[PDB]
Structure 1
Amino acid sequence: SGPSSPSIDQVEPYSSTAQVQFDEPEATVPILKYKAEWRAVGEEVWHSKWYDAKEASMEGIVTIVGLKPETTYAVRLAALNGKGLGEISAASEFKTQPVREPS
C-alpha cells in the first residue's frame, strides 16, 4: 500500500520557514514523492505540500514555507511510491523564530 513512514529527526525553524529532516529506508520500487503536513497550535486543519523524492533525498529534507513567526507547529511526513502513499509519520513539532533583527 506504500513505503514505511519517515522518521523526523531534526527540524531547523526560521521565522516563516522550517527545514524538516527525516530518515527513510533505502529503496529496495523507489520512493517517488513525500507529503508533509503541518498545523499550528490552535488549528484543526492540517496544511500539506508535496515534495519530489529525488530532490529531498540529498539531505532527507523538506522545507515548509509560509509559516507564522513565534508559532508552534506539529509536523508529519508520508512517503509515496508506485504502490501508493504510505503511513504518515509520528508528529514532530517546532516553534518558528521571531523575525530576525535586520543586520
Structure 2
Amino acid sequence: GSSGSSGQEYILALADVPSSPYGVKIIELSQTTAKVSFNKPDSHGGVPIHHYQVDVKEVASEIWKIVRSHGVQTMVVLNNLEPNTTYEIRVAAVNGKGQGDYSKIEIFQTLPVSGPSSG
C-alpha cells in the first residue's frame, strides 16, 4: 500500500484552517490598555485551536503589533497604547494548520487621560 510513516492521515491530513471568530468586542477599555473579548469560531479547521493571534496598530501607524495569549482563551488585554487615540485590532484563530482568516477589523479608541487620582 504505502511506505514510511502512515496511519493517522485519513482526515487529520486533509483538514483545513479554523474560521474567523465572532462576538469580538472591547468590554474593558482604558486610556493605555484595552481588553478585547470575543467568542469561539462558529467552526474549527478540523484540528483543535491552539491559540488566537491578535494584531493591533494605530490607524495612522504602519506597524502591526502581534500579541499572543497564554492559552486557548478568547480574552486578552492590550498595553503600551496612547490615550485619546484609535487603534485597529483583529482577532484570528491559529491552529496546527495555521492562521485561517482575520475577523472583521475592529476599531477601538482609548479613553482620554483624566487623572491618576480616583474621581
TM-score (norm 1): 0.82
Root-mean-square deviation (Å): 1.9
Q: What are the ranges of 5 or more consecutive residues in structure 1 without an aligned counterpart?
A: none
1:1-103 matches, cutoff 5 A: 1-11=16-26, 12-25=28-41, 29-54=47-72, 56=73, 60-101=74-115, 102-103=117-118
TM-score (norm 2): 0.72
Q: Give me the whole-angstrom Cα distance separating, in 1, the residues matched to 2:114 and 2:93.
A: 33
3-state SS of paired residue (2:51) = strand
1:54-98 deviation digits (Å, cap 9, x = unpaired):
3x2xxx311111111110111101111122221111101111012
State the Cα distance separating 1:17 from its structure 2 match: 0.7
Q: Which has the higher contact order (CA 8 A, sep 6+)?
A: 1
4+ residue runs of structure 1 moved beyond 6 angstroms?
none
Q: What are the ranges of 5 or more consecutive residues in structure 2 without an aligned counterpart?
A: 1-15
1:28-62 deviation digits (Å, cap 9, x = unpaired):
622101110011121122111111333x2xxx311
- Aligned residues with identical type, % of pairs: 37
Q: How many residues align?
A: 99
Higher helix share: 1
Pair member with larger Rg:
2
Higher mean alpha-carbon deviation, 37-46 vs 27-36, is at 27-36
